[PDB]
Design a protein around this ligand. Sequence first.
Ligand SMILES: COc1cc(N2CCOCC2)ccc1NC(=O)c1cnc(-c2cccnc2)s1
Ligand SMILES: COc1cc(N2CCOCC2)ccc1NC(=O)c1cnc(-c2cccnc2)s1
Lengths: 268, 276
Amino acid sequence: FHSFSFYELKNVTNNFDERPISVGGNKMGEGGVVYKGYVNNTTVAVKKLATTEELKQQFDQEIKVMAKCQHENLVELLGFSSDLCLVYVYMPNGSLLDRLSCLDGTPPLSWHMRCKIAQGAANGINFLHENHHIHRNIKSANILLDEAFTAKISDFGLARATAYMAPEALRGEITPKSDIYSFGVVLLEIITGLPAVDEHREPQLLLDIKEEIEDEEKTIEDYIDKKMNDADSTSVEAMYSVASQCLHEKKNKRPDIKKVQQLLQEMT
Amino acid sequence: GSRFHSFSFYELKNVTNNFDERPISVGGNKMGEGGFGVVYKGYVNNTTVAVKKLATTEELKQQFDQEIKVMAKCQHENLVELLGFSSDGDDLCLVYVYMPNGSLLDRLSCLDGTPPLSWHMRCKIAQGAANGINFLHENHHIHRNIKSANILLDEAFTAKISDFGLARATAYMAPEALRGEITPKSDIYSFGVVLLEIITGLPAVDEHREPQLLLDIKEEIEDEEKTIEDYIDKKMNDADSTSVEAMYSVASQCLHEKKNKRPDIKKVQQLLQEMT
Ligand SMILES: COc1cc(N2CCOCC2)ccc1NC(=O)c1cnc(-c2cccnc2)s1
Ligand SMILES: COc1cc(N2CCOCC2)ccc1NC(=O)c1cnc(-c2cccnc2)s1
């Protein structure tokens, strides 16, 4: 790793300027707050956390996993700082969530680009499960996009050996099959371009459109992101089938990640 | 809480042998425990009563207040009656009418070698409990802690609900409840688990069982990997296959993952009636 001074990280983020980028500040996202930092002629992403021992276990746990798991579809952790700070490679196209809601006037992702992203995301989850890690916080905000819109998973604070959470996950069980479920919600966001939860929407939870469509109260067509041109019905119907399976209430009925990989590959 | 009596903490302490924590069975005063306290055997006016001594602190007082608030509104054949309360002393206490046959959980687990409940009594108890829940929902309340431990049994094995501390106007909780939604369809879900307890005589959770949650046998049975008859409580001799399957059918409907696909309480009552 690299070691970073809290002093140094403070200066390269303009003293952790919490104003948004779109104002001339340094904040890129929050959930922890992620800042844009400038080191020499390179750009980095600095997450600064905000019980406190819970924060500490998460801080620690993220570093433990990052040390072991390195992969093309995982965000690289350059370094650390001990407030607690984590330093990552900057991902120029930001989060899946940002691009899906077309933040900052970026053009909508194409269907072609969304399938590649679904596939890269699944590849990253597979690497984790292959090495007996469970992510526990898979979501649109935690999938990041490099210069080529390659998907990379991040935010391992909760990794171990609401809108996104499986029933058993909510019951407190720890299973890689909960990652699968969460990934299902991500796939619905990818298809619809809608947020996983919307207090003013019906239904409030995106995962619930699965029931609407099963009851024939809606159709997939009713929900497809109207902002893309290249979405053929077949492949969209195929990604949905994947999401539907992933969202099964019983963990045992959900496909494992390798099977999800195969299905997403057959899709294209 | 003007409909109730205010009791001195000292007098409750006196009549529970100073809240003697050893079990009734060895001459102590503890009858049960769990939800925010311990329930002791006590007396008022030479009559046996149940005394719950509550055990943060401001959440506790609010649950204390909430239960008194709710008992003041809700009186019914299938709800436990509150006699009074104590808050003057070192701990908050709630004093209830004594329920001689204890909790449904005690009786299903055959606590202290007591005989198994017959199938006909399990049916009376399932109907009584549903009737208590109907009364709550009719009066626009949500119980939020329906479980076999909170269904008590009088001399006639008449089912009476209690523990209203969480009432609003993990092994038991529906998916949407775990997400912090508050809806009466969640009580239905919990009641579904209770119905499985009644059919199987198994605890809602067993850390050492497969599956660990009784909820999960539903998936096992639908797969035909196991049958109802595999799980039926083998200690009753009067359980006929038709009505057992009918009760299981009701439980299975209550345990639908989606709340809008569950029967409301009146439908549950009808289905239970059509069983008997
Ligand atoms: C919101 O995130 C970003 C936004 C942008 N945009 C781009 C367009 O202009 C406005 C901001 C750029 C980059 C990023 N992020 C990164 O570079 C990250 C690297 N690792 C990270 C992480 C995130 C969460 C939890 N754990 C780790 S984020
Ligand atoms: C476990 O409870 C009992 C056990 C027994 N047995 C009998 C046989 O020997 C051993 C103990 C008797 C009675 C009771 N209970 C009552 O009488 C109750 C009246 N209100 C109640 C309550 C319970 C919870 C939360 N809130 C209220 S308890």
